[PDB]
Amino acid sequence: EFTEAIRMEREALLAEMGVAMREDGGTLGVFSPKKTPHLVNLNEDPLMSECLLYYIKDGITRVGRQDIVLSGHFIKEEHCVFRSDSRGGSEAVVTLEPCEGADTYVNGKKVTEPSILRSGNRIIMGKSHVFRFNHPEQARQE
Amino acid sequence: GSEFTEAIRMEREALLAEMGVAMREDGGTLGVFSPKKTPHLVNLNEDPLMSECLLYYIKDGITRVGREDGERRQDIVLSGHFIKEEHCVFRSDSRGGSEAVVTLEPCEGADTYVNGKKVTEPSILRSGNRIIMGKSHVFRFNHPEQARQERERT
């Protein structure tokens, strides 16, 4: 019974990772989140401190030099904030809000006021941090 | 009791550290680190509704790439029109310390490219290499320990 508990726990975690397990049993890789808005890090440095993938879930995700910590020298103490609000609907609405004196860009355009993100948007923070925003639910219906 | 519940906690803890999953302070999932110590592929496809993984582990030993469902079981399955049943094979060996040496080789009739050059025999991969499989699948190959060793060069 303990063994089954253990298995169930691990099966459950490998879902909240989208971590794909081979049929034989081993780790194969990590899926793109099918149901959750997220950022894909476009930095190529295999030694970077930042995540490759950040989940943007219901609620508040704070980005700064905090939930999402960035090492870039132009990222500010508090840099920007992601807000996800579903509003009893089928679809989360993700807005990006700048902080004061902090440079963030969406498709090359400076962010000055909260802005609704679309799947595929490229987000740049400071000089060195580049992400692709994906919203798979939204993209499904686009 | 405490020994059962702590066992699950410690297993989550380890499982997290192993899969490079980062956690928020409130205990929710923050994101996933690229592997610190294992070679891997990063899918360069921008479509968030793709069938393939965003990241594939390239572990010690053999990793076969091909099409789903036999006749020989494949490890990484791709759907591209030009992917062959058996397409290419990664082989990783730690000989003789320190870091894994990872080769990529073709299977009969299958096109695979590294930095634009067709793979015709086992070729040693270098961190940063761009890999095309078939005509439609594109990955970045990363080898963090290899890259770290090189960066630490004196």
From Swiss-Prot, chain B:
Transmembrane segments: none annotated. It is found in: Cytoplasm, Cytoskeleton; Cell projection, Neuron projection; Cell projection, Axon; Cytoplasm, Perinuclear region. Residues 63-119 form the FHA domain. Expressed in neurons. The modification Phosphothreonine is found at T154. Kinesin motor with a plus-end-directed microtubule motor activity. It is required for anterograde axonal transport of synaptic vesicle precursors. Also required for neuronal dense core vesicles (DCVs) transport to the dendritic spines and axons. The interaction calcium-dependent with CALM1 increases vesicle motility and interaction with the scaffolding proteins PPFIA2 and TANC2 recruits DCVs to synaptic sites. Belongs to the TRAFAC class myosin-kinesin ATPase superfamily. Kinesin family. Unc-104 subfamily. It is linked to Spastic paraplegia 30A, autosomal dominant: A form of spastic paraplegia, a neurodegenerative disorder characterized by a slow, gradual, progressive weakness and spasticity of the lower limbs. Rate of progression and the severity of symptoms are quite variable. Initial symptoms may include difficulty with balance, weakness and stiffness in the legs, muscle spasms, and dragging the toes when walking. In some forms of the disorder, bladder symptoms (such as incontinence) may appear, or the weakness and stiffness may spread to other parts of the body. Spastic paraplegia 30B, autosomal recessive: A form of spastic paraplegia, a neurodegenerative disorder characterized by a slow, gradual, progressive weakness and spasticity of the lower limbs. Rate of progression and the severity of symptoms are quite variable. Initial symptoms may include difficulty with balance, weakness and stiffness in the legs, muscle spasms, and dragging the toes when walking. In some forms of the disorder, bladder symptoms (such as incontinence) may appear, or the weakness and stiffness may spread to other parts of the body. Composed of an N-terminal active core containing the motor domain (MD) and a neck coil (NC), a central regulatory center containing the FHA domain and coiled coils (CC1 and CC2) and required for dimerization and activation, and a cargo-recognition region containing a coiled coil (CC3), an undefined region (UDR) and the C-terminal PH domain. Dimeric motor; dimerization is required for ATP-driven processive motility. Monomer in vitro. Interacts with PPFIA1 and PPFIA4. Interacts with CALM1; the interaction is increased in presence of calcium and increases neuronal dense core vesicles motility. Interacts with PPFIA2 and TANC2; both interactions allow the recruitment of neuronal dense core vesicles to dendritic spines and decrease in presence of calcium. Interacts with SYT4 (unphosphorylated) and SYT11; both interactions increase in presence of calcium. Interacts with MADD. This is Kinesin-like protein KIF1A. It comes from Homo sapiens (Human). The lineage of its organism: Eukaryota, Metazoa, Chordata, Craniata, Vertebrata. The gene is KIF1A.
